[PDB]
Write a protein that binds this ligand. Structure first.
Ligand code: HEM
Ligand code: HEM
Ligand code: JRS
Ligand code: JRS
Ligand code: H4B
Ligand code: H4B
Ligand code: ZN
Lengths: 411, 407
């Protein structure tokens, strides 16, 4: 069964057959669409099927389906599972696994890049200090002095779920948030809770508006430990505007490397709970969301004041006006410092080309429109006009609850 | 069964129970989400009738009553005999208000109970439809002080006697292809515009030529009519700080009046039911003006602005877009024509959602359509989880009449 998606700006129609290979569920029913809902120990029993299916994918892609190396590997995994209950991925399968999880990430507009992922195998890691080292190396490699390179570092898979490796930070680099006694917030409001945990684990907080948080790392189910990323390793870009000279005086800066550290990577039924990955920013992530969300740094008002906009009625579009300036500033600052960044026009257009190619060669590209469309200027980017079909493929990245919610403290 | 929706900017959580009353299907399955796809009998009629009337009588707090039961019999007897039935005026007003109330793509629903309903079910000809329409247009325009309205033509019978307004809006501009290969006017209406000429219309072959009405009564061939020019309120488009903006020559009409939808109440189908409210600025400034396949004017506005159009990364489109939209809101307000901005509209919709959650148990809402086509995340609807589902009464789309009409 074939499904069609139309682009209402070009009348280009596409046929999806790939959704057919989709087993996980969406949260939707024929009676309800949950398309805008943000979040809608295994058995030997369930594991070999998931293994088989993954290895069948892998082997097809290398054009070896049904080969002897294919049959043998299935038989090998099959035995390893019954004997040991889990199984180990070959390097080749891990790489392929990790690239595919990205390729399948329906909410990611950056996917045209999926096949270029640098995979770092950290499955021999045993301790938090071991993790700090792997993470430091990932940061330096990926940062590459501003010429950012995508990368993922993969720690040991879950075994009994009592020995999980976890990166407690949501991103490797993020700024502290400090709730004050007067209810206000200093720093990033999104990171207040995590910040507190760090302080409580004995982090001495400098308490500024842009303090880079320490890494809190859990190896093998043990209590997490704190570490400071070498500062010479954290590339930051001070934010200025190409015409507004007072802009720099806002004191804004941002880190250059976005690196998601709280997701679970599932491959062939295995669960890698620590698998930080990084790319480079699309400008609106910082300029729209990070700076302008009301519950983030919320600088729209102050930027608006400085521009002397009529802030007395929303119908002056002062908010919109300040938002464009701030986003101009972000892109300007990055390009000027030669740190990789991509604007939302260029990014969304790339995604369209990527998506069409994916339909052409793969029969589909699962995409979540609520997430692919940028948080400003939606309809003047080509994805807005693009119908999309959202469904779950594996390998995949998934959310997991915050570890402080689940962790058994050893004390 | 009892679903929650969280607002991620305020943390407020709402519980949805109304979705259990949902009847129609979404196009989604457990395997695949179609949330961003634009379009995913005597036996049939009585269930529908019953379910509508049960909600009507319960809404008036007469559920069960003898008045309720008698009506159920009466409609039943009439279906059984006439193979269809007629709504009381009170049911027609309720039905219409509720189809708007249930429109999950409409951000403007906070207004839903104020709909002025005009019952045109006694209409029999296209000249009659024209008259009703002109009266609707004038009442709603109200010299710039728009009032929402819907005019309802006779309901479908055998379906060889449908009333239809072939226009998609009562008021839209024409579109002509040129040997040039460019498009003059509204590229969206190019086909319809042809279908008009092919029907005898003298197109002024301009950029903002108000289309003529093409009205079809009782299944007959559709007829042309020009809306009295004086009934079409239009706003010239100027900018509160760009003098040169006037020169772009932009104008838009004040009355958004959707005419091609089908209103279903109690299983009865009203295929001609034009309705109208008033514009949210972005509808014109973002979509009509700047959609690539619409009047697509960003390019020129950008040039007039002397912005660096060398690289996408200057955000010159984004700059021009804000300006274009400041100018629309500016123009309407200056001329005292109702218009709402996206900040105000979405904020009022969040209030409406909350009212609906506590008053009705929920509010079907299609996030893909409710989030404005500019500055998404700086509007509060961006951060609002919404549950989308189909309730009746409803407005549905219907095939273009010309693919359907037998001349
Ligand atoms: C190369 C530059 C990249 C860009 C510009 C990019 C862009 C984005 C953006 C804008 C989002 C939306 C999330 C939000 O705004 O909250 C996103 C989500 C996501 N990206 Fe990418 N991405 C890139 C690279 C990567 C890489 C290397 C991976 C993994 C290998 C990845 C995996 C994902 C995943 C799993 C999501 C969904 C995350 C969530 O659900 O919050 N991305 N990406
Ligand atoms: C009074 C002020 C109103 C505002 C600001 C408003 C706003 C909007 C907007 C922005 C949309 C999305 C439009 C698009 O971009 O295509 C929409 C869709 C819709 N509106 Fe409202 N509206 C208003 C009044 C009404 C009234 C009076 C009705 C019916 C009585 C109505 C019924 C609908 C329906 C059924 C849709 C979905 C149409 C579709 O699926 O294409 N609206 N509205
Ligand atoms: C690797 C990479 C590169 C890039 N440019 N961009 C990204 C997305 C992250 C950065 N900027 C925001 C995204 O971070 C992930 C944000 N959190 C997940 C969404 C979520 C789920 C459930 C509950 C919530 F509250 C939130 C990744
Ligand atoms: C009554 C009212 C007031 C208002 N402010 N705004 C509105 C929305 C209309 C005007 N601005 C666009 C909407 O008109 C509906 C346009 N088409 C429906 C979507 C669709 C489906 C299938 C195929 C297509 F090509 C298009 C109505
Ligand atoms: C409720 C709503 O789905 C939620 O706010 C989503 C909308 N789209 C998004 N899109 C991206 N890229 N990032 C986000 O955090 C969100 N938030
Ligand atoms: C493909 C996508 O569904 C389509 O472009 C939708 C998205 N959201 C929309 N939202 C509104 N209000 N109006 C539209 O015409 C559309 N188009
Ligand atoms: Zn859905």
């Amino acid at each position: 069964r074939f499904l069609k998606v139309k682009n209402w700006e070009t009348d280009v129609v596409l046929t999806d057959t790939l959704h057919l290979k989709s087993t996980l569920e969406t949260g939707c029913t024929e009676h309800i669409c949950m398309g805008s809902i943000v979040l809608p120990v295994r058995t030997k029993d369930q594991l070999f099927p998931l293994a088989k299916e993954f290895l069948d994918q892998y082997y097809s892609s290398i054009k070896r389906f049904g080969s002897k190396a294919h049959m043998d590997r299935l038989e090998e995994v099959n035995k390893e599972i019954e004997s040991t209950s889990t199984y180990q991925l070959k390097d080749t399968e891990l790489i392929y696994g990790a690239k595919h999880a990205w390729r399948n990430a329906s909410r990611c507009v950056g996917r045209i890049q999926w096949s270029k992922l640098q995979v770092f195998d950290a499955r021999d890691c045993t301790t938090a200090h071991g993790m700090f080292n792997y993470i430091c190396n990932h940061v330096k490699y990926a940062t590459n002095k501003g010429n950012l390179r995508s990368a993922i570092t993969i720690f040991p898979q879950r075994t009994d779920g009592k020995h999980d490796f976890r990166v407690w930070n949501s991103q490797l680099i993020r700024y502290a948030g400090y709730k004050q006694p007067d209810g206000s917030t200093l720093g990033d409001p999104a990171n207040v809770q995590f910040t507190e945990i760090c302080i409580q684990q004995g982090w001495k907080a400098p308490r500024g508006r842009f303090d880079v948080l320490p890494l809190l790392l859990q190896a093998n189910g043990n209590d997490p430990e704190l570490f400071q990323i070498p500062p010479e390793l954290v590339l930051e870009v001070p934010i200025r505007h190409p015409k507004f000279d007072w802009f720099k005086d806002l004191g804004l800066k941002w880190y250059g490397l976005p690196a998601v550290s709280n997701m679970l990577l599932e491959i062939g039924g295995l669960e890698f709970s620590a698998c930080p990955f990084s790319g480079w920013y699309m400008g609106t992530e910082i300029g729209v969301r990070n700076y302008c969300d009301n519950s983030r740094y919320n600088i729209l008002e102050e930027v608006a004041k400085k521009m002397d906009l009529d802030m007395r009625k929303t119908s002056s579009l002062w908010k919109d006006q300040a938002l464009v300036e701030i986003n101009i500033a972000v892109l300007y600052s990055f390009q000027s410092d030669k740190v990789t960044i991509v604007d939302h026009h260029s990014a969304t257009e790339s995604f369209i080309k990527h998506m069409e190619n994916e339909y052409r060669c793969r029969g589909g590209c699962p995409a979540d429109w609520v997430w692919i469309v940028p948080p400003m200027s939606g309809s003047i980017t080509p994805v807005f006009h693009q119908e999309m079909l959202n469904y779950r493929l594996t390998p995949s990245f998934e959310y997991q609850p915050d570890p402080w919610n689940t962790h058994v403290w050893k004390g």
